[PDB]
Amino acid sequence: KRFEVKKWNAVALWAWDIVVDNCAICRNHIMDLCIECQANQASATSECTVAWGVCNHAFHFHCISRWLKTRQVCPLDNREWEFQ
Amino acid sequence: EELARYCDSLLKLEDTLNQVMEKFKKDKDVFQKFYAKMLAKRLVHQNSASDDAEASMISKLKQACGFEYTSKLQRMFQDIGVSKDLNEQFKKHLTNSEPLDLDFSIQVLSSGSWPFQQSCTFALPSELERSYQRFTAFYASRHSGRKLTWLYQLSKGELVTNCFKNRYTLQASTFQMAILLQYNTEDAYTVQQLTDSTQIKMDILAQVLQILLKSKLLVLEDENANVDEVELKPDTLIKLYLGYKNKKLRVNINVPMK
Amino acid sequence: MAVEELQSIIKRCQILEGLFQLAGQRCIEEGHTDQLLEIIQNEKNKVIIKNMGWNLVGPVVRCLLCKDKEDSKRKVYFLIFDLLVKLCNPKELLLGLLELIEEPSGKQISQSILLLLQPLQTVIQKLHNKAYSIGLALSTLWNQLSLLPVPYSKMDDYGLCQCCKALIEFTKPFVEEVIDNKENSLENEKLKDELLKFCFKSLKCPLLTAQFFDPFRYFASEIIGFLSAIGHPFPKMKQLADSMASLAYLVFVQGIHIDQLPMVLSPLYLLQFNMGHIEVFLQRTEESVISKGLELLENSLLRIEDNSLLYQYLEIKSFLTVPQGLVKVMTLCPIETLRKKSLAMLQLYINKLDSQGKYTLFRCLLNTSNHSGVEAFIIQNIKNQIDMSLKRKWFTGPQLISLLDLVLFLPEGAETDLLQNSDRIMASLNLLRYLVIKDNENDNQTGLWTELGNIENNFLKPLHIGLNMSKAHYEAEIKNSQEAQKSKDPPEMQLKVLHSALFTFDLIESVLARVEELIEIKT
Ligand SMILES: [Zn+2]
Numbered sequence: 001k002r003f004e005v006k007k008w009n010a011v012a013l014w015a016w017d018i019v020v021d022n023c024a025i026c027r028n029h030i031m032d033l034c035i036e037c038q039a040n041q042a043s044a045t046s047e048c049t050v051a052w053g054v055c056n057h058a059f060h061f062h063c064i065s066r067w068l069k070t071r072q073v074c075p076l077d078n079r080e081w082e083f084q
Numbered sequence: 085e086e087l088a089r090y091c092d093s094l095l096k097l098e099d100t101l102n103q104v105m106e107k108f109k110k111d112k113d114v115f116q117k118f119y120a121k122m123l124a125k126r127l128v129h130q131n132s133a134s135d136d137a138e139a140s141m142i143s144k145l146k147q148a149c150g151f152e153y154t155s156k157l158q159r160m161f162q163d164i165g166v167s168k169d170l171n172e173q174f175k176k177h178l179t180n181s182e183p184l185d186l187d188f189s190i191q192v193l194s195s196g197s198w199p200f201q202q203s204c205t206f207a208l209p210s211e212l213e214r215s216y217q218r219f220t221a222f223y224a225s226r227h228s229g230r231k232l233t234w235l236y237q238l239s240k241g242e243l244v245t246n247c248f249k250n251r252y253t254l255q256a257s258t259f260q261m262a263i264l265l266q267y268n269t270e271d272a273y274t275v276q277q278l279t280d281s282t283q284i285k286m287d288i289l290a291q292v293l294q295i296l297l298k299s300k301l302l303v304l305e306d307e308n309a310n311v312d313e314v315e316l317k318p319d320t321l322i323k324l325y326l327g328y329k330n331k332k333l334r335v336n337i338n339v340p341m342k
Numbered sequence: 343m344a345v346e347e348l349q350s351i352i353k354r355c356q357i358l359e360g361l362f363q364l365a366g367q368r369c370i371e372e373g374h375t376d377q378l379l380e381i382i383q384n385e386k387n388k389v390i391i392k393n394m395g396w397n398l399v400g401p402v403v404r405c406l407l408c409k410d411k412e413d414s415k416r417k418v419y420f421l422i423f424d425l426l427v428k429l430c431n432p433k434e435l436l437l438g439l440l441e442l443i444e445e446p447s448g449k450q451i452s453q454s455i456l457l458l459l460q461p462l463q464t465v466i467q468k469l470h471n472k473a474y475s476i477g478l479a480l481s482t483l484w485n486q487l488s489l490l491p492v493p494y495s496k497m498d499d500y501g502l503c504q505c506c507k508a509l510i511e512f513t514k515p516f517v518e519e520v521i522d523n524k525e526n527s528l529e530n531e532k533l534k535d536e537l538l539k540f541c542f543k544s545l546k547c548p549l550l551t552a553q554f555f556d557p558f559r560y561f562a563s564e565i566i567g568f569l570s571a572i573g574h575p576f577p578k579m580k581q582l583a584d585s586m587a588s589l590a591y592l593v594f595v596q597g598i599h600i601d602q603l604p605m606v607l608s609p610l611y612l613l614q615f616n617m618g619h620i621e622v623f624l625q626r627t628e629e630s631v632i633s634k635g636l637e638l639l640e641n642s643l644l645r646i647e648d649n650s651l652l653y654q655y656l657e658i659k660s661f662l663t664v665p666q667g668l669v670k671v672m673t674l675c676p677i678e679t680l681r682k683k684s685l686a687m688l689q690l691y692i693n694k695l696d697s698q699g700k701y702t703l704f705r706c707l708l709n710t711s712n713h714s715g716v717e718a719f720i721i722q723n724i725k726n727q728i729d730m731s732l733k734r735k736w737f738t739g740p741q742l743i744s745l746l747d748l749v750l751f752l753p754e755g756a757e758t759d760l761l762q763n764s765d766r767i768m769a770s771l772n773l774l775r776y777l778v779i780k781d782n783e784n785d786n787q788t789g790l791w792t793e794l795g796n797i798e799n800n801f802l803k804p805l806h807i808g809l810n811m812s813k814a815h816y817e818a819e820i821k822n823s824q825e826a827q828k829s830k831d832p833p834e835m836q837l838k839v840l841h842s843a844l845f846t847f848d849l850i851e852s853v854l855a856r857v858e859e860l861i862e863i864k865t
């Protein structure tokens with residue numbers, strides 16, 4: 001291989017990330033409507049809801065449900081999932 | 085202006101410092117801009133004579149013009165130390181895993197206090213990836229909530245060559261490295277192909293090729309072509325020259341652009 | 343002995359028409375201050391002490407200053423002081439007093455300023471003629487005074503507050519002078535110039551970092567007051583930009599002298615004038631200064647009705663630069679409250695702008711902010727607009743698409759970093775999720791049906807590609823990190839930092855896998 005990298009001296013700048021209160025799975029403000037339900041004609045199910053698991057990070061029940069039909073776990077950290 | 089430059093040209097004892105500090109009293113802000121830049125360069129490039137002396141200069145300015153005048157200064161310094169300890173920790177954290185085949189360092193800077201800006205479009209070379217992948221995920225462990233912005237155009241490295249009659253150490257820009265590395269695939273590349281690959285804005289890429297071409301390593305289809313003149317084009321062909329020779333084994337190809 | 347020398351130098355120089363200073367220092371230092379006064383009194387000889395004795399001021403003024411005071415010692419010093427201020431030729435005197443410029447620093451500045459302010463008057467009036475003098479004394483005074491830090495809710499150790507009230511007392515007589523004059527004579531002119539010069543100084547340094555309930559209200563009031571007292575009242579009002587932004591804040595936020603200004607009261611009219619000042623506040627790094635800027639923006643913005651703010655207002659610079667300046671502080675500033683606040687102010691701003699104004703500001707912040715988070719925020723907002731933007735536009739047709747090319751554009755798209763690109767991609771993916779759900783193909787008020795194929799090519803697939811490449815790299819780096827670890831015979835926790843990344847991928851995929859499930863299902 002004609003070119004081999006011996007050293008690399010790199011510069012990087014850091015800034016702060018911005019923080020907002022969001023369903024991480026879909027992204028919509030917690031306290032606000034889950035997105036699929038924002039795109040919905042007003043429905044029975046249209047009254048998704050705040051769910052918390054033991055891990056303490058929180059989701060729209062709507063979103064975390066379809067997350068839990070697939071894996072058994074929590075998406076953010078990784079833990080098998082029980083409510084609170 | 086030069087009232088500033090003089091200090092960095094001298095600093096590139098504390099007596100000869102104070103001997104400026106008198107002339108300091110004499111529009112100190114536009115001065116502090118320039119002096120900042122001076123310091124910044126003296127920092128990222130390492131060097132800068134005696135560090136304790138730089139600190140004594142700072143703290144000398146501290147009481148003089150008060151807190152906010154200095155503070156960005158102080159932030160650059162402690163940013164440097166912070167980077168030293170960062171690198172230490174990283175070398176220790178990798179110590180249980182497969183090592184990096186290259187020799188890695190990074191200075192991380194507070195985006196706020198440093199003049200440096202805007203990064204550039206760039207495509208990180210695969211050979212450069214794992215280092216990056218590893219350190220990114222490391223910083224995220226030491227600080228959540230932070231974002232890292234890599235400034236390649238200030239990033240330098242060392243290539244080692246296997247295809248020459250002789251083995252060279254090339255001290256190069258990261259744009260240089262990214263270009264050259266492209267030659268482990270093919271022996272000739274059109275400039276277009278090189279922007280579609282290293283993702284380097286053509287405006288920049290041109291000057292960079294011009295440097296490499298000036299360097300022995302790459303060559304045009306036209307041998308009679310003056311590289312200090314001829315204007316490179318999308319379909320222009322850049323060839324690797326295996327005829328390369330140097331009376332130096334470790335050679336630095338990374339040079340002020342003109 | 344030094345006394346004898348002093349007398350020898352007197353009788354030597356008392357015929358005619360530097361060491362002299364030295365014998366003064368000595369005589370004053372531990373020993374007799376008595377015979378010094380015994381020399382000056384009897385008022386012989388006036389000519390030297392007139393042309394010379396000002397030299398003795400410094401050692402005296404240190405023997406006042408450096409001395410702890412609280413003494414019946416000092417009054418004998420004060421005597422010879424006053425006697426000096428009385429008998430000395432004025433031109434060379436204040437200069438000595440202006441030695442204060444250098445002489446102290448930090449906490450012990452005030453006591454110098456407080457001590458010599460009166461003599462500075464008595465001298466300056468002695469020469470009626472010069473404004474240039476006052477210019478000098480005010481300049482130097484403000485120089486020294488600018489150095490001391492500005493307190494909040496604090497008794498003050500540095501003496502800044504009493505020094506500002508004291509300055510006001512000093513300055514009044516000079517501004518009460520010009521208020522009444524027959525003549526236009528140039529001395530009056532240059533006196534006005536120097537005066538208001540000092541007013542822009544004080545407007546600038548002390549008041550710009552100052553916080554309010556209030557000695558800084560008294561100071562502001564009294565200075566801007568001086569601005570009315572001379573010509574060019576504040577209402578009419580480079581490098582003065584700091585002074586002017588301080589003034590703007592002082593008037594509009596603190597309501598100081600707000601009465602003189604015309605009623606206005608259309609929040610628009612004030613806004614467009616004030617925006618510039620806000621920008622000048624936000625470019626600053628001080629917490630106090632950033633805070634003030636934010637307050638002025640919020641205040642200006644509170645009054646405006648939602649979606650009033652007209653597109654064409656963005657054709658003023660501050661109107662674009664300021665949201666940017668907000669994005670600056672959100673990301674770059676130490677103080678979290680300020681970051682959270684700045685984010686808020688951004689969202690308020692967006693809210694005020696009319697539809698196309700929003701679209702414009704989005705498009706700008708997308709290609710400007712260069713932060714994947716604030717890009718995700720911008721995406722959110724766009725989704726909100728699209729939603730609202732249908733009942734009976736800018737967020738619907740090819741304009742929307744033009745705006746989509748910007749969000750769904752993949753930088754180095756196949757290989758992008760999805761670790762730090764994770765949030766903007768989550769945003770974009772949810773926005774899609776909405777779009778494919780809301781409108782049918784064959785209804786198609788939105789966007790997409792035309793773009794869908796081109797999207798799945800230029801966004802969706804390469805995102806699959808990227809996810810794959812990524813999970814692969816990360817799994818591998820891990821497994822063989824273990825292989826390395828075991829082959830070497832702290833504890834492997836070091837690896838968890840990687841596991842995190844895997845989650846972030848499996849998150850996205852679950853989202854992506856969902857979108858396509860719809861992309862077919864609703865097709
Ligand atoms: Zn959700």
Ligand SMILES: [Zn+2]
Nearest residue numbers: 034037048062
């Ligand atoms: Zn729902």
